[model samples]
Target: KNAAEIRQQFAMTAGSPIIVNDKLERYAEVRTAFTHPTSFFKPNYKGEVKPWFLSAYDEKVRQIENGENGPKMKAKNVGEARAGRALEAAGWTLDINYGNIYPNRFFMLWSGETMTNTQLWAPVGLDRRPPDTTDPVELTNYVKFAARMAGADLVGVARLNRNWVYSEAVTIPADVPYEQSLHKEIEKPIVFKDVPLPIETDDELIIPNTCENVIVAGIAMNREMMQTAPNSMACATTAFCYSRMCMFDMWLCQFIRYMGYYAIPSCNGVGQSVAFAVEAGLGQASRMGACITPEFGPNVRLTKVFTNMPLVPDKPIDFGVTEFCETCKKCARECPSKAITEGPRTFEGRSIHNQSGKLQWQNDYNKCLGYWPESGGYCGVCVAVCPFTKGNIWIHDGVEWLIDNTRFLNITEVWDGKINTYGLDADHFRDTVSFRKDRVK
Candidate 1:
């Protein structure tokens, strides 16, 4: 099917998918649990102070010694615990501090023109040339095709939503190294200006007026690996996806620049990924505060590129996710930290970590972060147990269709399902393959 046919098969009316009351406001990036001053620092198992994730060092050691993967998550032996953490650590080789949030720093470079890949092929002068195609539809198809090739399991374009972008970003000095970056962390205002390109000054990060659209990419995670939540295997998969997100950003940003457009890469910086993914029709917002796609459910990671290229925006999807989350409190019930809300969605904030005014089920994110140290790994019970994260068997699709067409209705045991390489569901992998005729005008 063509783009229209695809939209007809899965898209919803064009509008913001989640509810936004008049009180909805742009939130500062520093307010998030990861970067907030109040929660950013925690004690490692050895009594040394470090960033939130690093603080788990003590619990991780304890678990290994006790022959546990998480809190009482008994491993067959200590070897399993060691192997899990080893894989998880290895997976994050490409990512910086778990995410490329420090804009213009490390892997989240604002421009691709200076990258080694872009310079090596500079004799052809791709970035120097004028854009050969200016049509929105053609560019949309071309960029999307390039995104697929760059490792995106799902892709969408949306007009930039500034409210979802951070009022300010969490960053460190340009000269700071990774080891010292956390201690020197600071906040800088993210402002839009009447400029030509994204630029960073001593006091601010400037986005040009021409930057109009956000291209959101979803990287799928291994289901089998994630099912071992609060364990090393789960952290390993999550860490690996963060690396995938980094590669996707660099690859796609280079493609756009070569196509003669300006792009801003944000592995986990600049804006809220879930909001961008929602607006771009990648998926619907779920109770777990994740973008639950029809393809991968909540078991996916998101990264985005802000660009000035002319492109058609995708419609926001309404596949009954909000309705589904309203009834299915599986995540709320199983959260080891009791952070998820079993109550109805509201516009009020539950704690300092939450951004108030947006209509959503408020969860105590501090409690969520608090559990990380105890588990010794990034616990993912919410995602592991999410029905949407199930495999792509006919039963799952049938339930999805019913939910999308009729109302929220849906699951089967994940353990009883078959497994595949990289934890990908083989049944739906072919659904993403696109050929020249299908992608080009």
Candidate 2:
């Protein structure tokens, strides 16, 4: 079968998957719980106050000592607990501050020549020359293949959606070094200009109007590891995928630049990934506010690169997730903090943290972030309990068929996976495979 045929199997008609109201506005980067002043700090394991995400360090140590994997779940033994935490910690070595979201910062440097990898390969002067190929189709295939080689389990390209791009970025001053970044962090405007390239000025993070496409990458997490939700093993997989996100940005950015185009590496920086992923056809939006892919469901991490390079935008998918989530309240029922909404999608927000005006199930995100301090981990109970996280077994297809055949009804209700290599399940690994024939027209 042809690639378009495969895409059309789940693709919606030509349009974005998200429906927005006229009131929708560009969101501020600092509004997210991770950066917000109200939810950013939490007590570490020793009861010492620290940044929210790092609060689990003490609990992680105690869990290992007690042979526990999560708050109450036990590992096979102390060695297993120790090993899981160690793996999780090591996974963040390549990442800067949980995510390389700050542009032109440590690992997310926008220009290539300043990077050690580029310096080492400078003699090749490949990036200094004009591109030999410029056709959109040819470049799409090359760059997409490079994405997979760089570690993306799923990839899609979309026209840049400025609404999804952060109006202002939460970042440290340009002069501030990494060690002092957190303390010096301040919000800076992210402006698009007629300039020639992406650059950071004294007052602004500027993107050239020439920049067009956003390439989104899906880094699939381990099924077994994530099943240990709210545990050290679960955190390990999440941490590792973040590092994978960092590497994918660097690798793909270099490839694009070498092909004579400017690329912006955004691991988590520039914008809202879930929106971009949905727009790019990587997946559909779900009740959990996560982009749910047919291959990995909501158990995947996302990173994206922005570039002026021409690309054919992929059609957004409509694989029945919306209708299903409309009825399946499992995530809401199982959410530890009771953060998920057991109601209909609307253009209104549940809290200030949510970007309202979008037709979505508005969960109380602040409530979700509040739980991290108490749980001592990024609780993934929702992801663990999501039925779509299960591999594409017969039952999954059967459920989907029923969902597609059913009617959409508004209701307030509640209802309620394995480990594999690289935390990926072997059963669903084949779902992402694409040959040149399938990838190219």
Candidate 3:
């Protein structure tokens, strides 16, 4: 209902609004880490070995550890650069360069036509078995339960709307290897063909007609760490979640395949995630340009898998985010780059980086990108100040909730109380898994 339908219905809040776009424009390609001008190069922190950002983050983290305060918050010289880097390495073990098309062409493909997970795994003869289950109702319960065990904080399924899938994806030339791929970066179209197997060519990526659904997974972040926005702690949290998103896709994809279906994984690449998330009923779009869910707000990282798995789609929720954002510009005000838009939704946007003809807040991604070099960190000030990032959903009823938004800092007590081995809270280790293998069996 544009603003009015949303406003009155949420006049007395109801929780997360999902707006569908029947005319939603299909993006030619996702403008991301590989194709993005900024991603083209920004000091190469992760690759440069010492990468100054890590050390700056290293020192800043020390400050937070000392209860002092920051490049954005306080710091000591807490020695975690080694630990953080180990974690940084561990975090990325599940993923590839940010935005790389995941499960690549291999896991995203098939051996034959009549072949399903059945023939693939059926040397054991499960193939002859009539798909232990094909019912959407049964798959929904079964897969969602499997998701929790696999490390997803939230999970939802939606029909694969071809509109959001990128017509083009950033790719390395077929002949290129890891070392030469960066220089060989090229755009490849993702096209759906009437074939049975997923195939790739110099011209485009082919999806089978049978490929029809998308499953999205949310990997939650730590509140105590995220609150230290625009600082080392904040960067640490961001880095950690990137890895989490990586692990989530492969694991969940494997689960779908086991259910006798085909699945494809995309970390940050494949397509516009927030849109698929909205269609799937995960959450509502927010001024920050993220899908804000009831559970983690925008304080979570999202990863998704595409599949032909017969499954149920979730209903979109509306907690009145648009109505609230119409007036609340806290994220904009707090944004260090001034990248967030405070005005009403529009079909127009500020730059080519943004997809036009969408009724949503337009942001200047260039300005947002500029800060990565200037701040020596991936700035998250906008997310840090968000009101929804703080919620009772994370608060345990009996356990002493470690996060306190009322008093943003002074975490010396909390840090020393339960600090764990890898620079994260020890108690959260059960929650802080880096890979499927890392997850408790």
Ranked by lDDT, the better of candidates 2 and 3 is 2
Positional deviation of residue 175's Cα in model 2 after best superposition, in angstroms: 2.5
lDDT scores of the candidates, listed in order: 0.82, 0.82, 0.62
Cα lDDT tens digits for candidate 1, 1-441: 122344345677778766777877788888888878787777776677777777787788888788777777777678777777787888998898879899998878887766888779999999889999999888999999999988898888999989889888999988888899977989999999999778999999999989999999989998877887877778888998899899999989989999998899999899999989999988888788888887778999999999999998887776667887888889999999899999998999998777787888898988898788868888999999888887532223532343332222300133345767556677678756666444433
RMSD of 1: 3.8
Native-structure RMSD, model 2: 5.1
lDDT of 2 at 100: 83
lDDT of 3: 0.62
lDDT of 2: 0.82
Give one digit per residue, the lDDT tens place, for model 3 in 349-409. Answer: 5776777656778888867765665555567888778887764433323533222334222
TM match of model 3 to true structure: 0.76
Models sorted by TM-score, best on top: 2, 1, 3
For candidate 2, write residues 1-441 as lDDT tens digits: 122344556767767768899989999989988888877777765678787766766677778789877777777778777777777789888998878878888888788989888899899998798888889888889999999999999999999999999999988887888789878888889999999889899999999999999999999987776776777667778988998899899999999999999999998888999999999998889999999887777999999999998887888887778888987888899898899999999999887788988898899888898777666567898988888776542223532332222222200010003345566666667767777655545
- Estimated TM-score for each candidate: 0.91, 0.91, 0.76
